[PDB]
Amino acid sequence: GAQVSSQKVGAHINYTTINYYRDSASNAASKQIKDVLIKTAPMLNSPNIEACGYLQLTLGNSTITTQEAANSVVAYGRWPEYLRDVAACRFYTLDTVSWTKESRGWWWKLPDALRDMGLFGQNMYYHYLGRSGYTVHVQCNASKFHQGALGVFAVPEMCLAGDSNTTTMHTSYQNANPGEKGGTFTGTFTPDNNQTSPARRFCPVDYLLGNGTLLGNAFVFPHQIINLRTNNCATLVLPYVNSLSIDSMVKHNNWGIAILPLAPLNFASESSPEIPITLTIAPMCCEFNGLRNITLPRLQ
Amino acid sequence: GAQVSSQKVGAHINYTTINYYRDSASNAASKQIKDVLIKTAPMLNSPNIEACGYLQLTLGNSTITTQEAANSVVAYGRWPEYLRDVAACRFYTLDTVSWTKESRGWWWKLPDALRDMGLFGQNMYYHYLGRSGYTVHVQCNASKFHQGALGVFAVPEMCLAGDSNTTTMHTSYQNANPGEKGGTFTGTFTPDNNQTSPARRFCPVDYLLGNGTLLGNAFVFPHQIINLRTNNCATLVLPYVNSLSIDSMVKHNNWGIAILPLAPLNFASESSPEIPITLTIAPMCCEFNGLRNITLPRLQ
Amino acid sequence: GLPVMNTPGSNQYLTADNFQSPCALPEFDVTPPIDIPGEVKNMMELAEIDTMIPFDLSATKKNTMEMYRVRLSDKPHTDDPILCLSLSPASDPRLSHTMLGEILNYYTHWAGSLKFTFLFCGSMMATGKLLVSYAPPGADPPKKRKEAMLGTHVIWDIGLQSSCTMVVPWISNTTYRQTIDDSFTEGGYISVFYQTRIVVPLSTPREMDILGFVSACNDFSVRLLRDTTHIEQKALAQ
Amino acid sequence: GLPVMNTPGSNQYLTADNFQSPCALPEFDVTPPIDIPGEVKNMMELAEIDTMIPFDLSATKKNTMEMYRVRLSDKPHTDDPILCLSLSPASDPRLSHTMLGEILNYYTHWAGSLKFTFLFCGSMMATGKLLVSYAPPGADPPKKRKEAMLGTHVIWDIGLQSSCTMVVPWISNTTYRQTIDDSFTEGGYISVFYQTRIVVPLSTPREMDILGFVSACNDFSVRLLRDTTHIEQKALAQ
Amino acid sequence: GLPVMNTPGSNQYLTADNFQSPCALPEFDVTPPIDIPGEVKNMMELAEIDTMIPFDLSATKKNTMEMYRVRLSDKPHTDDPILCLSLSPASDPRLSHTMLGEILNYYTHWAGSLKFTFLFCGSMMATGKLLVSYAPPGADPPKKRKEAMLGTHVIWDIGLQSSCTMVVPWISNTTYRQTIDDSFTEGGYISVFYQTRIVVPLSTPREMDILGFVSACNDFSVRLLRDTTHIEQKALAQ
Amino acid sequence: QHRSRSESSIESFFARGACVTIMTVDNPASTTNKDKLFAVWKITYKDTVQLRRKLEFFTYSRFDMELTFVVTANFTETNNGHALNQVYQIMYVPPGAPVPEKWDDYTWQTSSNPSIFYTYGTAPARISVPYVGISNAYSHFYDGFSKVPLKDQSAALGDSLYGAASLNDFGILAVRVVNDHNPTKVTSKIRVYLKPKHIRVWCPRPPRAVAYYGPGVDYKDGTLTPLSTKDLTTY
Amino acid sequence: QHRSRSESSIESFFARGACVTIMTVDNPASTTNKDKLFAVWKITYKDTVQLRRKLEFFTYSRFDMELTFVVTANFTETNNGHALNQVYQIMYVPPGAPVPEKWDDYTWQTSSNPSIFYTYGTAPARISVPYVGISNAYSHFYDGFSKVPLKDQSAALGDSLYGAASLNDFGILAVRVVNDHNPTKVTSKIRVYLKPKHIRVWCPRPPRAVAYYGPGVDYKDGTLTPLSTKDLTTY
Numbered sequence A, B: 001g002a003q004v005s006s007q008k009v010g011a012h013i014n015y016t017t018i019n020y021y022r023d024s025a026s027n028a029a030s031k032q033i034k035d036v037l038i039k040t041a042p043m044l045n046s047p048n049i050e051a052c053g054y055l056q057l058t059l060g061n062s063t064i065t066t067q068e069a070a071n072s073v074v075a076y077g078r079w080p081e082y083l084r085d086v087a088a089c090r091f092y093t094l095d096t097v098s099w100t101k102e103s104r105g106w107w108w109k110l111p112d113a114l115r116d117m118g119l120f121g122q123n124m125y126y127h128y129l130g131r132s133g134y135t136v137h138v139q140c141n142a143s144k145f146h147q148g149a150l151g152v153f154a155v156p157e158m159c160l161a162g163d164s165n166t167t168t169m170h171t172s173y174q175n176a177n178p179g180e181k182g183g184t185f186t187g188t189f190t191p192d193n194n195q196t197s198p199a200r201r202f203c204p205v206d207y208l209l210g211n212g213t214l215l216g217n218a219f220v221f222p223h224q225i226i227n228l229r230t231n232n233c234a235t236l237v238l239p240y241v242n243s244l245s246i247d248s249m250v251k252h253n254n255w256g257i258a259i260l261p262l263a264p265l266n267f268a269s270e271s272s273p274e275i276p277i278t279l280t281i282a283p284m285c286c287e288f289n290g291l292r293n294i295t296l297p298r299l300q
Numbered sequence C, D, E: 001g002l003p004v005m006n007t008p009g010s011n012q013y014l015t016a017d018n019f020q021s022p023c024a025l026p027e028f029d030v031t032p033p034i035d036i037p038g039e040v041k042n043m044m045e046l047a048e049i050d051t052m053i054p055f056d057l058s059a060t061k062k063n064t065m066e067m068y069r070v071r072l073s074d075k076p077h078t079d080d081p082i083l084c085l086s087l088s089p090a091s092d093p094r095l096s097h098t099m100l101g102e103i104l105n106y107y108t109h110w111a112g113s114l115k116f117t118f119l120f121c122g123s124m125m126a127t128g129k130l131l132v133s134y135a136p137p138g139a140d141p142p143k144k145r146k147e148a149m150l151g152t153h154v155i156w157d158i159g160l161q162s163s164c165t166m167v168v169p170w171i172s173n174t175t176y177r178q179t180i181d182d183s184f185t186e187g188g189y190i191s192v193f194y195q196t197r198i199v200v201p202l203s204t205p206r207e208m209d210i211l212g213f214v215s216a217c218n219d220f221s222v223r224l225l226r227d228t229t230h231i232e233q234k235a236l237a238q
Numbered sequence F, G: 001q002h003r004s005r006s007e008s009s010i011e012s013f014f015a016r017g018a019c020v021t022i023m024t025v026d027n028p029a030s031t032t033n034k035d036k037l038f039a040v041w042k043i044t045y046k047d048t049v050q051l052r053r054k055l056e057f058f059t060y061s062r063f064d065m066e067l068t069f070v071v072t073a074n075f076t077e078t079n080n081g082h083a084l085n086q087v088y089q090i091m092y093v094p095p096g097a098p099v100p101e102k103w104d105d106y107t108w109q110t111s112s113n114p115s116i117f118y119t120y121g122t123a124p125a126r127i128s129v130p131y132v133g134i135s136n137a138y139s140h141f142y143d144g145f146s147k148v149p150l151k152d153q154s155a156a157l158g159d160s161l162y163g164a165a166s167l168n169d170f171g172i173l174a175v176r177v178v179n180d181h182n183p184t185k186v187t188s189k190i191r192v193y194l195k196p197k198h199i200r201v202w203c204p205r206p207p208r209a210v211a212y213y214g215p216g217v218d219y220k221d222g223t224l225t226p227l228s229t230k231d232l233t234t235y
């Protein structure tokens, strides 16, 4: 059973191997042009609804009307799919937010943001387990005389940093889960000094993506940019991502949506402009499991 | 002589072995749907006279008349057989006992319980060696207005705990072997404190199967239940079980019969009811060996 | 002398190793095996044997033959629980010391479908309907028939048949669950109820007992062998 | 006893070794893999992802969301630099903390073509032409369009398209360059200029921002794995 | 555990050993070779290159560019030696520091034919005949042409050709000679003489220089690698 | 000719043993009023920073693991007395099993738990562990909770730590000097080096830019300004 | 895909070395009024509890056996003096053979008995033993007696212990320090680890629920209430 193979050589002969043990774990580590501009691993680079082979975007009775599409991205090059081997899952439009010359950014979590959306939300709380992918459609228009740029980031397991410097990992379930409402980024860290009666919530610094890493590198995550000059909307198609095939939607949030001003909003000459950002999100290829009496969370 | 074989792998390659020594003992350890309700190893689960392919139950001149049979069990899925490569062995009915609202349980040992039964007993004491299997038929009827449940357990090597806390393994041969008479279980441990002149006998606590293990688990042993509601009798077919092909019937008891009230006897409304339990036992496929003068035990 | 080089691990003694070693009793002629009835090949075989549940571990009746008996009566209908139990096969007091529970404690991880069986030990003249329920985790544990009803359930007719089996199918987020109480790998709730009520005629007992049993289904398995807490030598010194 | 002879190296522990060792958890049945989206096979795959450059590491705006914005204006034409940067992917303050730069710091040697991309985040009514330049090492670093013009360059028309990519082709004397500032393996100069000027109409913003990005091309590789300075435990004690 | 038995030599470190050892930089992608001119494959290749002899190691002219020049003149005929030298390639002061001699000192044993070449650097109008001689060991070293004449010799005509080569053929009792002065392995005597005399016309230089060179022939080889005395660290401490 | 990307493959990148922890044990004079010291470490990659930062380039990982143990010892007091060679016992206590309370106790019988008996002065000890996760992959980040707060039940019961799954993921390493109390005292240290073998990684992330502050993603005031000053138009 | 039951196979279940005993020996100063200490242990799986409880899941068993020996030593007195490396002799004395009465005596010649000469500081000693039973299987439980009381003969002669077969099943391990008395005293300990290989088991039993109390099934007053309080209608 001796295994002979080519040695790791320079560029101007081989070695032999025998496995002594029954468990593979015991085994030694087995070590494995024209156009430079081309990506080695495209999918890791944020492809388009176009770029993997896949306008009126429609789910159930809900439907987006979109010319914008080169502005879309399929996370990790992977399209949503059923746990293999429903019109509760449709497009829900969340409460519109306002972008101003001084906004630092906004965040949301999935499924959390959708927890009260019609039959979807119901299905979520009546079952132990649930899984779902998403289509995130960020809407934000302005004039040809306005300027600015939004960075729309979809982060897997988006754990955010807390307000305390005396204790760690202590943000309350209530605070961690804002629902549709949102949750927002800040320009500076402000430690919750109230010892006795703790705020127990996140303190997300913008240039650190609220998680201890530099915002400039947030682009290694599935993302899209809204440049007011060229486009008014972004569409992110998100797959179910997890260390499990299915999980508790109530205990665990799979994806995080982060929206930050890469370039600040500016208009004509007004000292203080504003424009709306509307998020319409739809759950995809979704399925639930382990039906029983309804979960009634202490959200407060 | 190198031996090549498949490695113990996950589920997304092998190893080599050579024996260096002449004795197998020196060798390393060699490591080896549709319906869930089905048993992996049935025989370990107490099968029926029916369930392995095998009413008037008759041995020699002795004969049981039984409709009850789904109520039978063949221990370890194994039917009695001759030591391979007689009408002394027939049905003997032992002294009837009485089940009351306060009985804690009863025990017997084989061959011991049969030591005085006609030619069987004789054969046992005239020979050095003897082996036998058994058919144990527990009889216990009541009315449709009575209630209760008997757990009938057949235990291999049923070593029972003693009355002493100052010394161990000290129960006398006489006390360990009650004969037909029986032997009984208790609800509480009462240490024989008489130092100087020791009782030298067992103290079998019911919930501990008289042996330090929990009664609730006694079902891993060949057994049967008499539920007064559904059936009035139980039949256990016991194979010869031992670390030897044949042994001394006088020195060693192979099987233990334990009968315990899983659910207490109750009737209509009488504060204190009673009903009889009769045991009829027959030795099976039995054979003796090493004839000589008769063994006259000091049973007292 | 064949040129060799010693690697890390050399001269160590790993108690879980699997190597050859010299025989102290060379040429020893072993006593042959005989066909002893009742051979076991896998601990899981044992876990699949139904053993009896100590349901009533109440102060006064625990550690007695009573802990095994769940008492019922001809009392008027109610939507309140006959018994409430958590699906923590290795860690729940009531399940932990059963044959299944005991084997589970020599291991760290479990997975598979469990099988519950209830035996009605009351009289033949007694009749009734009970509701057996299983609720997957994540919500308030059922305190009322009305909510138990909503999960996986079976309706048992006492009068028609004396015993009743319910399979609690493997449903978990994680591939395996831990053999310890832990929220992250919780299994949910088993509970029993009166569907109608126990009904008896005159001249017959108004109270009776049910016995209950648990075992593993054949889809069941365990991993990561470990020492148990269910026994000890505190007095030992190793 | 097969006759053996121990060689130098025996009993040592080299942290970079690759040998077999006994398993502590024998026969353990592993949880199967699932097809998780987003698998990475090589750190270089990551280095090829465009991340945003902290260009303005000025005293007051470093370590803030501003360091990322290069400001431009409708001001009159000038031959002075919009931004000057050195091709030291791992050691230059502006490049070093980008995803490319970070990976480069776990290694000692780099080689390959880099790819710079600029994004114009001003308004639609804004127009202009910029000149992006790369100068291979060995001369005075370009301070004026006139000299930048002389090296590898691209002319970007803002009005026509919002973004612009320039590839800095691998040109080096040595086979590989070091991941530290060192004259011997210097890489040259990237600089940006106004070709014409930014022009806007009335009622529109006269100042705007450009964002810039860097990543590795597919001809790129690194060698000699090493520990980074970009993190530490000073308080540690090993 | 495969039964083994350690032999003498175990755990030792022989500096001349040749064994495998683990790589500290696994999977390292080496920089490819290029075809650099001037590759050497054997130290003997170097020993075969003619280098210039320091003949006149006289007190006042040693360690100066003069030690290399053997001076001749138009003087009257004489049978006395122009230069006397011993065939001790590694140990004779004059030969020892030549490229051949230097390589010879990293070794203990030599064998083969040596090749001496003389270059006449006087003027074109100069004429003359010289006698070059080699005398195998065992007799009085030649002090006069008359006796040099008797051994292996060549007659060089300066006027006709400017340079002259003489091969000293391998002739030894022992298979190999030692790279140290030792009577037992002595090699004999090289000496040069005036056959006729150097003759020049008027208006021309009466004295001139000859340069001399040595190298190994292709039949040459050396053995038993060793450290040299031709360099040191006295101040070192090892 | 042609450059290879081999040394930057995910295996090559992690193909090194890294110090994940230092355990301290001892063996004191029997007389002593204070207890014999045995070590109990909770297995994790987060006590040190370097392997952690490298793993955190990724969200999810899957790998067989190799642990190597470097043991060193020394004398505590001036004493001048000595000690015979020490043997160490490295026991793995999986979540559920009895944790040792004394250098002495029954838990060290180790009938079902894996133990390593190491002899001082010999080649560093080493074992391999399979991928032991209860999920399909090890999760480097969990944006969620162990348990959900139910309106009904009380506030305290429903509570749990952010980002944490099981109170006990991988159990613990218990270490002791098997030798009996010695007149003159010796203190020892066990260094645990971890190397991931046969590794796979998913969902990439940006490297940690600011000092770690506990097991989570949290950061500390005053550590938030990593970047250096450098002017825009300056090479 | 598909879960394997391999780690719960009877071999995998017992595929571990378990401490079955700790033997104590020593090597004193020749002067000493007290005798040099050598160990005599009667082979059994019942002196410790863990391997015992596991084996007792079954009535009868059959297996080749592997014994591994961990030896540790230490200094007894303040002394400050020293001792050269110790060599231990582990002799197996089978039922019938002369049992040693002195560290010194002729029995240690070991001409026919198996002995292990162990050198201190070296890899723990190890040997394999075949299935040595005189019956077709090892019996974990014997509901019977060694001998039957005959009416005729006297009461005392006919007597024997319940549940016990031979006064001497497997003989004994005798251990000594081969080295001669040393000025400064050293005490050593031998830990015997047992692992059953090539194993088969028959007739299953419920696990021991209450504390063991000797070699038999006996239980002690005050240890009989294992189970915990937990109310019927409480999750």
Ligand SMILES: CCCCCCCCCCCCC/C=C/[C@@H](O)[C@H](N)CO
Pocket (backbone or CB within 6 Å): D024, F043, F044, F045, F065, F067, F090, F091, F092, F114, F115, F116, F127, F129, F132, F137, F138, F139, F140, F169, F170
């Ligand atoms: C005799 C020594 C045996 C040592 C056995 C060690 C077994 C435990 C291994 C756990 C490996 C953990 C690696 C990191 C896991 C974590 O990523 C996470 N928090 C993932 O869910």
Ligand SMILES: CCCCCCCCCCCCC/C=C/[C@@H](O)[C@H](N)CO
Pocket (backbone or CB within 6 Å): C024, G043, G044, G045, G065, G067, G090, G091, G092, G114, G115, G116, G127, G129, G132, G137, G138, G139, G140, G169, G170
């Ligand atoms: C140099 C060392 C040699 C050691 C030789 C040891 C031989 C004796 C082995 C006996 C193994 C006993 C295992 C348990 C046996 C018992 O189950 C019973 N009481 C069964 O009848």
Ligand SMILES: *C(=O)CCCCCCCCCCCCC
Pocket (backbone or CB within 6 Å): A001, A002, A018, A019, A020, A021, B002, B004, B016, B017, B018
């Ligand atoms: C395939 O492996 C057959 C050829 C094997 C060569 C034999 C020598 C190998 C020695 C090690 C085997 C024992 C290790 C468990």
Ligand SMILES: *C(=O)CCCCCCCCCCCCC
Pocket (backbone or CB within 6 Å): B001, B002, B018, B019, B020, B021
């Ligand atoms: C079958 O075994 C023939 C091939 C054997 C490979 C030869 C190398 C094995 C070396 C160990 C043999 C000596 C051990 C007693």
